[PDB]
Write a protein that binds this ligand. Structure first.
Ligand SMILES: [Mg+2]
Length: 193
């Protein structure tokens, strides 16, 4: 079965350098066969609000997706609304109106480097994602936290709660931005296999 993939990117300013995120997107995407009858990719960026960078059916080829992924700019933000960004991907990104197809497996990839301001909604948002059979891969970047000498225990536990089970398979603990690209092959093959 094919796959509708929606990448949800935290765009907060603490994430640096943005080139690491786009390099991560490029590497993950270039090894996919994007098409209306193949894999479809949609990308959403969130900070304090949410923005659909491009819908699931916006681009019909891998080359096109790559071009669009490289153009994504960091929108910034002072408070991380992960619940909002995730719920929106479920509510809007994954809709026929934006390209989502029938009889296709839905996959969400969440990338963030901080604890969410609306973490009180995560329980509900996630459960709704589960009821809709959306497989979730969450990635926590401990870069800004470590550099700020902040405790990452709760943060890791929170992003982990977003991941689908097993968990050790859907959750990725990334030490820093430059290390993002090192999970591409594993994540890549897991999204599919
Ligand atoms: Mg942040």
């Amino acid at each position: 079965t094919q796959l509708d993939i929606v990448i949800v990117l935290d765009g907060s300013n603490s994430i640096y350098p943005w080139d690491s995120v786009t390099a991560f997107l490029n590497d993950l995407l270039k090894r996919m066969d994007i098409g209306p009858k193949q894999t479809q990719v949609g990308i959403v960026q969130y900070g304090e609000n949410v923005t659909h960078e491009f819908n699931l059916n916006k681009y019909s080829s891998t080359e096109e997706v790559l071009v669009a992924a490289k153009k994504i700019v960091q929108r910034g933000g002072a408070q991380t609304m992960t619940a909002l960004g995730t719920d929106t991907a479920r509510k809007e990104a994954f809709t026929e109106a934006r390209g989502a197809r029938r009889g296709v497996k839905k996959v969400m990839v969440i990338v963030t480097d901080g604890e969410s301001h609306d973490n009180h909604r995560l329980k509900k948002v996630i459960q709704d994602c589960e009821d809709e059979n959306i497989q979730r891969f969450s990635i926590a970047i401990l870069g800004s936290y470590n550099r700020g000498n902040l405790s990452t225990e709760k943060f890791v536990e929170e992003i982990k709660s977003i991941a689908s089970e097993p968990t050790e398979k859907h959750f990725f603990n990334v030490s820093d931005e430059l290390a993002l690209v090192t999970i591409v092959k594993t994540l890549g093959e897991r999204i599919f296999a």
